[PDB]
């Protein structure tokens, strides 16, 4: 088993910011239960970087398969056991999270040359399943450049088997990821884990165009959220 | 479930002092694995009071039955789920712990009148099963008075079913506890949970004679250990 700390008491937390503000300053996996969530679920809490970040997505080493269909992107998948592993929290969980409070999205990015950048968006919100988990994002700031925005109309989430109202997957690309794609496909943090510069039939890697363009696949991603108005306790 | 923190990595710790010195300052239940222990086991770590205390016994509310035989006192029993619950760590585990390093025993005591005291003994050591888990204790200091010492020859542990080389229990007292009894029976922190002053056939309560005498049963006990030469990290 992992090192685990059993506090010997129970309290329900909506997100990692509430955990941090209750005095828990250790990064690790915790259970959270957003207001409208039918059950608690594991999430990585990044308590660095000012504290209280709920990690919604992580890439690190290429271990996990992100070529998943609508169901897996809805429910969540990946590694909720290892500190440095990879996961997708699940669109249903994103919706339950981002409707209970107004969150900032921060995206921590690293390349294969030990460089890092970040992108931050105020008011990140994910719509419900009937609305294809559509993305709303507010004001950008940071160093990575704004690759997420549909201006690069809310962007629907798509998967290989749920793409422009086709449910069968017959026009899907190889290794097609789940994302809120814009016209330029300028971001796809759920793309194929290549080792930096790459070539393939399509530009389907871990792309953040405004930093390294379409044909460079990033080394590390953490997508994480915290309330816009988060105030760290002490 | 309780609030639990999964660090997402593994490291083996011999005791709660090693956990604390590795940067974990939260009181709670952790797994430890003493050098000679065949397996890891849960223990409460009291990280207050200078840090790194491994709790070996706790009394709080009278929930658990301490009228247990040799086997249960050897293996450990009680509540390893609730912060304020009661347990006995187990004599085999005490032996594995106290032979790997030289520990100080601290005993935190409270009465029903919101008073507290403590007793501390340098070089607490518990012998092996063949030697009836015999107690060795060194220099006393504190406010509660020295009720543990056999001077009040190493004291053998006894239970109802292992008492003066009788294995059947035919001369056992009602509610007889497991302890290292001295002649005066001046301590029995494993005794019956009465509410302070009490009367019964025998003085079989949670007794620490040097503080409140034989016929007063204490409210709270924590018996905990840390290496004599423990140096807190930062």
From Swiss-Prot, chains A, B:
Keyword field: Adaptive immunity, Coiled coil, Disulfide bond, Immunity, Secreted, Signal
Domain Fibrinogen C-terminal: 7-229
Compartment(s) of residence: Secreted
GO cellular component: collagen-containing extracellular matrix; extracellular region; extracellular space; fibrinogen complex
GO biological process, one term: regulation of immune response
Induction details: Expression is induced by interleukin-6 (IL6). Up-regulated in a number of cancers, such as lung cancer, prostate cancer, melanoma and colorectal cancer.
SS bond list: 16-45, 171-184
Tissue occurrence: Under normal conditions, liver-specific.
Function per UniProt: Immune suppressive molecule that inhibits antigen-specific T-cell activation by acting as a major ligand of LAG3. Responsible for LAG3 T-cell inhibitory function. Binds LAG3 independently from MHC class II (MHC-II). Secreted by, and promotes growth of, hepatocytes.
Self-association and partners: Homodimer. Interacts (via the Fibrinogen C-terminal domain) with LAG3 (via Ig-like domains 1 and 2).
Name of this protein: Fibrinogen-like protein 1
Species whose genome carries this gene: Homo sapiens (Human)
């Amino acid at each position: 088993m992992n090192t685990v700390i059993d506090l010997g008491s129970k309290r329900q937390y909506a997100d990692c910011s509430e955990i941090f503000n209750d005095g828990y300053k250790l990064s690790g996996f915790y259970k959270i239960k957003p207001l409208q969530s039918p059950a608690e679920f594991s999430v990585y809490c990044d308590m660095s970087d000012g504290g209280g970040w709920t990690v919604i997505q992580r890439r690190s080493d290429g271990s996990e398969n992100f070529n998943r269909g609508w169901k897996d992107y809805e429910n969540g998948f990946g590694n909720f056991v290892q500190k440095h592993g990879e996961y997708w929290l699940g669109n249903k969980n994103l919706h339950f999270l981002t409707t209970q409070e107004d969150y900032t999205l921060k995206i921590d990015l690293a390349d294969f040359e030990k460089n890092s950048r970040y992108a931050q968006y105020k008011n990140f919100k994910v719509g419900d399943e009937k609305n294809f988990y559509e993305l709303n994002i507010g004001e950008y700031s940071g160093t990575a450049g704004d690759s997420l925005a549909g201006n690069f109309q809310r962007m629907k989430f798509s998967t290989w088997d749920r793409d422009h109202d086709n449910y069968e997957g017959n026009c899907a690309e190889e290794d097609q990821s789940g994302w809120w794609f814009n016209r330029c496909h300028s971001a796809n943090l759920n793309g194929v884990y290549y080792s930096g510069p790459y070539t393939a039939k399509t530009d389907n890697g871990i792309v953040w165009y405004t930093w390294h363009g379409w044909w460079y696949s990033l080394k590390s991603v953490v997508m994480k959220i915290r309330p816009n108005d988060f105030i760290p306790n002490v």
